[PDB]
Amino acid sequence: SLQTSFVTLDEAIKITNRRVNAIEHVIIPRIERTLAYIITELDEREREE
Amino acid sequence: QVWPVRQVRPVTEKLPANHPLLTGQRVLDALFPCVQGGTTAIPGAFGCGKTVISQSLSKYSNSDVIIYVGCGERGNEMSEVLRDFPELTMEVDGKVESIMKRTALVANTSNMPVAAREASIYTGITLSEYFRDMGYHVSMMADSTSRWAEALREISGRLAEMPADSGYPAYLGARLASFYERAGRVKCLGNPEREGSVSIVGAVSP
Amino acid sequence: KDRIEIFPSRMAQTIMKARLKGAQTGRNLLKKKSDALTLRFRQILKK
Amino acid sequence: YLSQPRLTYKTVSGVNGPLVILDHVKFPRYAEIVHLTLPDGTKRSGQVLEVSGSKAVVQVFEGTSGIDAKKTSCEFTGDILRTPVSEDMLGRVFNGSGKPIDRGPVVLAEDFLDIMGQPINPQCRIYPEEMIQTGISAIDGMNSIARGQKIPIFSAAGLPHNEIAAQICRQAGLVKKSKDVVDYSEENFAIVFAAMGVNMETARFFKSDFEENGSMDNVCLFLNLANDPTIERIITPRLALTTAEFLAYQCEKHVLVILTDMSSYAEALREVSAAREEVPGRRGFPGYMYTDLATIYERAGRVEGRNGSITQIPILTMPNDDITHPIPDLTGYITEGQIYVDRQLHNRQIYPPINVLPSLSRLMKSAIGEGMTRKDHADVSNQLYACYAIGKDVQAMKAVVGEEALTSDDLLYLEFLQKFEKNFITQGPYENRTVYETLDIGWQLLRIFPKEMLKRIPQSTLSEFYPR
Amino acid sequence: VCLFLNLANDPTIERIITPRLALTTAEFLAYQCEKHVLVILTDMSSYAEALREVSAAREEVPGRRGFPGYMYTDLATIYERAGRVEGRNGSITQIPILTMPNDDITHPIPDLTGYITEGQIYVDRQLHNRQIYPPINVLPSLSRLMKSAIGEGMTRKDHADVSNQLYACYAIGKDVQAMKAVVGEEALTSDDLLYLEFLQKFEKNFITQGPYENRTVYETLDIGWQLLRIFPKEMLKRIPQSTLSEFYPR
Structure with a gap:
């Protein structure tokens, strides 16, 4: 019983770790850069007026 | 003597920096050594310590005078450094002696006029230069630099200037450079042939 | 790819800040699950 | 002093918007108060905005409408605005302009002062040295307020910050009673409250509640409904501050000024700027908003040699719950500390919804201490x-690990969470808790665990307080 | 060496004139003395700031980030004055240097420079954080004149192919x-391992030179081939089959 649980829990940990890693090294920088660009554009538009 | 504020005194010649600034703490004194006649910047926010560095440099340093500049400060720092005058005392001649005899303070509050807030940093530079000219080793803490930035934005607010970035006038960079330039070791202009220097410590407050 | 495709605006700033906050909360929640999973792994291998 | 007869003009070179331009005025000065009389007999006040040779411009307070060219009188006063301050104003209620509205008499002025005030010398500042109690356990215990500290209260549209303000008003005071009540009877504390940019329901609610609490004998009240002229919005604070100054430094009292809805102040100032034709600044707000809020906030603290103090608790709302909006940004920069309220906590039906996690303080370390309080405060807060x-x-x-894998100590932490949100924070509108009650409840909540888990408390106080 | 020095002490308006003066001197020495000249203007970002300062006085129309609209034409007036002219012998080379505010490449100054001039270098800071010398990125660097700079009889037969x-x-x-950075080491196939070891070896070998090491060009090509030989010949797609046949095995 112990060994069965171990063998399945290994791949469970692997998929969870892959998900958290992909989340922390793909989407967050992308959103942050988009927000930087948005702030810049808003500033431009106000200054023209 | 009365001397205009917006101009630099003459000297014989500027010289290289070849001596390390003495700091009471071995940390940041053996790793990231500041230099006598140097130019540096330190972050500043509540709870960590900004005037702690002021105390440490004012007591345990080879400097011959401290010139502190304040913008948008409370009477706290004034009264506390006043307490440091008879508390932080040095046995230079084997006798405890007050820091009041050495240092000087120039400060203002937010509610004082804007132009005074701006002229503060220049009069501080001038005083530092004047005491340097006498063959000494000045250290000038031009703290609350971001406050001076807001002061410049305020000045530009009533000039119909083009906002370079977030209201900052165009000549912000010119004033920054002209400020930090006035520093470094010099052989002084005069018959005695003495030598001194000025350091600057601009407290960035992001 | 490097920028989520939307027209810049203030409303857009609100939605993107919200999406960033959602991603952060998801990351923290995943970190907690990973903590529990590695605890189970260690306790299984304990003895 | 002044003895010359006043002038009056029947010259109108034009009108535009909220302004009225005239000319042929003899030796005008800036910031001179001006009266007006219309054809129909109405009387309206105003101020001088622009002056250039014999040309003058006056911004009419009450709003321009139906002002003829030839039939219009315009009397001049020759003096800047001056407030009739007086100690006896306590127990009264006023409007923005200072005219009483509670069926009472005009104030028999005790002294005249400049509305703008004067800057206070930084040399004669005194650091705060002691705390106060606001009546809220969540605020006093977790976040001390010294004498002279400037702590704002960030809120947003749709929250019950006004109820919190009223609660603070009807329960604010001192805790000198640590040693004896006999020496505590010497009470010299008062409150000045400046409701501004407030709708009608809230104005009536304030008036009724203040009258109900029975402590109106030490409360001054200023009201400025959103109907009243927009310029009176930016004159109410100056009157309130001048009164607070006169009470603090001429009667040696301990005054607590509470300002409401500084966002409305900002909006009114914006409108004045735009009417004045000045170039806009950042986000449409004027550039010198920083200086203006500075000259409003900076009138407080303590003065050496005077037994008195002024404490400021401004309130404001954050548009769109945006913490980087300029108004809260500048307010945070000028002032010391901050207190939050959080939407979720109000949405949990918890009153007062005070979110202590992002709430800070700047003078808590020195506001509290042995003598002025118990010796068991700072460690309890930590x-x-x-x-x-x-x-x-x-x-x-x-939430994800599952409740089954939790240790028993984990259940103790959850028990602490639920009890802390059930009793310490929730107080109810009239449960007047003192500081000592607050610390009693704090120790009781701490009793759940053993002293071993309580690793922020020193053992010396553990041997005394923990086994109670 | 003729020197032109304008520290921050000097009034900012002189910064408008100094470049054109130096460039005029260069043109004289290039076409009236038949010498070969190299120009080095430094921190043209400060020049752009001074241009913004002087323009704001007149209230001209702005552009992106508040710079003058005609700032493009002005930078063109500066940069272009360079090259070699028929019937002479001298020539003008120019190597301006500019800093990038906040590393934002879309900023108008670097963009308009990228339009006028025909290349870039893009010093990297990641390598400087790893303490590498000389830390120069190559992926965004560009040199438009290589298509005729190299070839048979100039450097070597396959110089372009090695580069590609x-x-x-x-x-x-x-x-x-x-x-x-996401999938993990288990998901890597063999060619990923080959590419990663190539990346590491190439960074520690090709880029890293040292304060005064001056490699010959042929040494550089030998080193480049030494890095290319790591991969098997059946994967170097861009190189022609001939060059691989005559050079790769050694």
Whole structure:
């Protein structure tokens, strides 16, 4: 019983770790850069007026 | 003597920096050594310590005078450094002696006029230069630099200037450079042939 | 790819800040699950 | 002093918007108060905005409408605005302009002062040296207010910040009673409250509540409904501050000024600027908003050689719950400390919804101490904060880790969370808790665990307080 | 060496004139003395700031980030004055240097420079954080004149091919690293390992030179081939079959 649980829990940990890693090294920088660009554009538009 | 504020005194010649600034703490004194006649910047926010560095440099340093500049400060720092005058005392001649005899303070509050807030940093530079000219080793803490930035934005607010970035006038960079330039070791202009220097410590407050 | 495709605006700033906050909360929640999973792994291998 | 007869003009070179331009005025000065009389007999006040040779411009307070060219009188006063301050104003109620509205008499002025005030010398500042009690357990215990500290209260549209303000008003005071009540009877404390940019329901609610609490004998009240002229919005604060100054430094009292809805102040100032034709600044707000809020906030503290103090508790709302909006940004920069309210906590039906996790303070270390309070305060605050943070993040953990894998100590942390939100924070509108009651409840909540988990408390105070 | 020095002490308006003066001197020495000249203007970002300052006085129309609209034409007036002219012998080379505010490449000054001039270098800071010398990125660097600078009788027969293939391997190596940052070592196939070891070896060998090491060009090509030989010949797609046949095995 112990060994069965171990063998399945290994791949469970692997998929969870892959998900958290992909989340922390793909989407967050992308959103942050988009927000930087948005702030810049808003500033431009106000200054023209 | 009365001397205009917006101009630099003459000297014989500027010289290289070849001596390390003495700091009471071995940390940041053996790793990231500041230099006598140097130019540096330190972050500043509540709870960590900004005037702690002021105390440490004012007591345990080879400097011959401290010139502190304040913008948008409370009477706290004034009264506390006043307490440091008879508390932080040095046995230079084997006798405890007050820091009041050495240092000087120039400060203002937010509610004082804007132009005074701006002229503060220049009069501080001038005083530092004047005491340097006498063959000494000045250290000038031009703290609350971001406050001076807001002061410049305020000045530009009533000039119909083009906002370079977030209201900052165009000549912000010119004033920054002209400020930090006035520093470094010099052989002084005069018959005695003495030598001194000025350091600057601009407290960035992001 | 490097920028989520939307027209810049203030409303857009609100939605993107919200999406960033959602991603952060998801990351923290995943970190907690990973903590529990590695605890189970260690306790299984304990003895 | 002044003895010359006043002038009056029947010259109108034009009108535009909220302004009225005239000319042929003899030796005009800036900021001179001006009266007006219309054809129909109405009387309206105003101020001088522009002056250029014999040309003048006056911004009419009450709003321009139906002002003829030839039939219009315009009397001049020759003096800037001056307030009739007086100690006896306590127990009264006024409007923005200072005219009484409670069926009472005109104030028999005791002295005249400049509305603008004067800057206070930084040399004669005195650091705060002692705390106060606001009546809210969540605020006093977790976040001390010294004498002379400037702590704002960030809120947003749709929250019950006004109820919190009223609660603070009807319960604010001092805790000198540590030693004896006999020496405590010497009370010299008062409150000045400046409701501005407030709708009608809230104005009536304030008036009724203040009258109900029975302590109106030490409360001055200023009202400026959103109907009243927009310029009176930016004159109410100056009157309130001048009164607070006169009471603090000429009667040696301990005054607590509470300002409401500074966002409306900002909006009114914006409108004045735009009418004045000046170039816009950042976000449409004027550039010198920083200086203006500085000259409003900076009138407080303590003065050497005077037994008195002024404490400021401004309130404001954050548009769109945006913490980087300029108004809260500048307000945070000028002032010391901050207190939050959080939407979720109000949405949990918890009153007052005070979110202590992002709430800070700047003078807590020196406001409290042995003598002025018990010796068991700062450690208790640190322990409560640490326990609560552990409990909340631990609830976040159990949300996915499952409640079955939790230790028993974990259940103790959850128990601490629920009891802390059930009793310490929730107080009810009239449960007047003192500081000592607050610390009693704090120790009782800490009793759940053993002293071993309580790793922020020194053992010396553990041997005394923990086994109670 | 003729020197032109304008520290921050000097009034900012002189910064408008100094470049054109130096450039005039260069043109004189190039076409009236038949000498070969190299120009080095430094921190043209400060020049752009001074241009913004002087323009704001007149209230001209702005552009992106508040710079003058005609700032493009003005920078063109400065930069272009360079090259070699028929019937002479001298020539003008120009190497301006500019800093990038906040590393934002879309900023108008670097963009308009990228339009006028025909290349870029893009010093990297990641390498400087790793304490590498000389820390120069190659992926965004560009040189428009290479198409005629090199060839048979200039450097070597396959000089272009080496460049193309090395850049391609560098790009795929960066891509593989970005992929490895998420998937994990288990998901890597063999060619990912080959690309990653190529990336590491190439960075520690090709880029790193030292304060005064001056390699000959042929030494550089030998080193480049030494890096190319790591991969088996059946994967170097860009290089022609002939060059691989005559050079790769050694």
